[PDB]
Amino acid sequence: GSRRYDSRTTIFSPEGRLYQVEYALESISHAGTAIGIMASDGIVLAAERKVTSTLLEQDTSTEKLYKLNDKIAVAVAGLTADAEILINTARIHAQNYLKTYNEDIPVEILVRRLSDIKQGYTQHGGLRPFGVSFIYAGYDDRYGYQLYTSNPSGNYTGWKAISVGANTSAAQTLLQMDYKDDMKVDDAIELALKTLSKTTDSSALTYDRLEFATIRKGANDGEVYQKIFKPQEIKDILVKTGIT
């Protein structure tokens, strides 16, 4: 029958590892680096695009940084198409919570839900897992600014600064060196860009290669603003920090 052709995507190896999760993580290690840094007065999300072509329409393009609601954003590392399936689910979960409780979804609850979906693909159904790692940047009135990551295993953890995708070992060493707890958003912007500038496989870090975003509680009159940076604005912050 059909058994013959079943890869068996949801089994343990003799060592107690999930084959398909491990191989999905290997896929993600080749994807463009994404960095999240959390400060006292905001969060930075920086991410490196993978496909440098002069003919790519950058201003209308979005492969890395997605908006989940007004308070929560994600940086993606892995298969973009896989990430979009999950993003639209997370967008729906946030609106289901808002409809039910008349309050914006707490960041951890949204994260746990997505992480539980990913987990399910590793334990049942016989399907391949999602080849995606997220950095969640968000704000709520309980814990304030939060950074999380989830990976194909469905495991998630909280961070002060974190990287996913390519060269994370190198990137995490650099962040661990220069990060401090009393740091501010402007300093974190500079740290994120400097870390990408050193870890990048490219010859030089330019505006046409980056997606950049900030979540600040530095909007008018104590609200939270998500800023997805335009190409010209990424170019300006590259000159300001002194990279180009």
Partner: protein, 226 residues
Amino acid sequence: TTIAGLVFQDGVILGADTRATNDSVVADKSCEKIHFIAPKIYCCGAGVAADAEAVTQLIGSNIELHSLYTSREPRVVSALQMLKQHLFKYQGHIGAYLIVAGVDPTGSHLFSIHAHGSTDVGYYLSLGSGSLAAMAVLESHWKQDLTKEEAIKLASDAIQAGIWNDLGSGSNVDVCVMEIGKDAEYLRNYLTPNVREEKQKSYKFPRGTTAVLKESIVNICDIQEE
């Protein structure tokens, strides 16, 4: 509602009034009852207003996809068959009464459809509360081989009969002309025999006439930003 359709020399024409009613009060004075199904297939609607609107839009959507799939001009019989099968399925609970007319590669066609899913073929038809007023005119004046000019006159007259003599019907006359080998011409507000007369007085109030408790600005924008 007064809707009608009749055939002429090398075409078919549809007519409709523009009144919608909720109990005994007028809900709309300028509503479009002649509906687009395909570029050369149109549908007059009567009965439950949402139903006649929704059923024509659904079949119009499916006719468009069918036309794309087959790479052909849609036929009136397709719209007819799809409408009647849908309406039959719902056993009259979708209370839509429709006059379907159009031009296609087979020729010109004119059908009526009732809410329970029965269909009729005819040279002149009328539906709605004003159908009897309209049919009286059509029975008195319809003949074979009408010119376009005579057909528009007769169609508009049949609708007018409904407008004046039926309380269900009123306001303006909408027409759609579908002629062979030509673009269909849709003529909204073809007649306007019921413009409201100028008022005796202006009821514009002196400013400050209304007593106010509070004022505030509403924030409609996204993020007031730093």
